[PDB]
Design a protein around this ligand. Structure first.
Ligand SMILES: CCCCCCCCCCCCCCCC(=O)O
Ligand SMILES: CCCCCCCCCCCCCCCC(=O)O
Lengths: 206, 206
């Protein structure tokens, strides 16, 4: 399952590079909103596919998915529950989706605050689960309960990952409704270049 | 380098199982201190070889060594800077090295307190390094400085790992001087069975 995920993610990155390049070329050519929206929607569809493949990987090996060892070294410094922190990515793209109207500014900052609150609450719940596993493993005839208990805890860990990816996807979705097509394209370009620069830097660390 | 480490560690575990079994058989046969000390010293030599292979792996890929992803899932709940926490392992073996004399009790508790203090200080330094890398990567013509800076930071991370393994080895060494051969054998048996039980439990999580 993890081998399949790593191959799928490799191909996902190749397609990500293409979709980011396509939107770069479109912004530079100042193409109209209709053609540009197709590229925005393609980028959004591509992220949706990432979340799908991550959900499968979490079922296959939640610990590996959580370790971030499938991402590059520099990306791991910015990981929160199996991916990036949406509240921080909002700061990354903020200068590029500007200028924002007053209403858009209120909507984006609201979204950032609510994502921050959701991230903190999920982190607190995951912390409680993890500390409790530390304590319970430490204490721990096999009639089947130990494996069943392990599967309950794996399901609980997977739920945290799923909820974190849900928050990431929901934040991307809500930005796509706040922003015009052109603002969204600029934000997606910035987000894509951010991820690419982190991966490029990891090559220097290797 | 990491592929070589994982193969070396696999063979290390196979030999660990043999050395733990050999000392189990010896304790049960109530063999004399001279033959028993050979088995104690073999166990100590085997841990020394673990630290050697870990030092090579830290040079090859410090992040992988630190991730603990080369250990089994349940062991990762108990990892501190690239391995187990010596102060906690002292608690694991304490019931089995008993009865201790008053002097031995003072020496062991002293060692546990000093290891705890060293662990906290190393954790604080690693935390400062890591938070500073988060901040500096976030801020970050290439004339060679970015790679050189990465190598300085990798060397600093490797130093923390090396210092943590030094503390682990020093604690094992100092226990071997406090304890009689028979107490040491009982403690090594307990430590070995502890690690084996954690690995066995990880099979249930998989
Ligand atoms: C129309 C969108 C413009 C740009 C919006 C950026 C802010 C949304 C943050 C969520 C991005 C999700 C991608 C991360 C995937 C992962 O962590 O594995
Ligand atoms: C004579 C020794 C008796 C038993 C002493 C146990 C307490 C010492 C703790 C250090 C053990 C080191 C093994 C861990 C290796 C690792 O973390 O990678």
């Amino acid at each position: 399952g993890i081998a399949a995920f790593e191959m799928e993610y490799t191909h996902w990155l190749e397609e990500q590079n293409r979709r980011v390049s396509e939107i770069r070329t479109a912004l530079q050519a100042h193409i109209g909103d209709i053609e540009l929206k197709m590229l925005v929607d393609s980028c959004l569809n591509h992220y949706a596919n990432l979340f799908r493949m991550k959900a499968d990987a979490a079922k296959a090996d939640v610990f590996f998915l959580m370790s971030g060892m499938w991402r590059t070294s520099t990306e791991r410094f910015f990981q929160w529950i199996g991916g990036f922190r949406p509240s921080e990515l909002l700061n990354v793209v903020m200068p590029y989706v500007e200028p924002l109207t007053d209403q858009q500014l209120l909507e984006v900052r609201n979204l950032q605050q609510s994502s921050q609150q959701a991230e903190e609450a999920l982190s607190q719940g995951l912390d409680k689960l993890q500390q409790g596993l530390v304590e319970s493993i430490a204490i721990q005839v096999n009639h089947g309960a130990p494996m069943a208990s392990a599967m309950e805890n794996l399901q609980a860990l997977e739920s945290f990952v799923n909820q974190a990816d849900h928050l990431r996807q929901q934040t991307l979705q809500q930005m796509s409704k706040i922003l015009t097509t052109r603002q969204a394209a600029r934000g997606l370009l910035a987000l894509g270049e951010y991820f690419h620069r982190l991966r490029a830097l990891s090559s220097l660390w290797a």
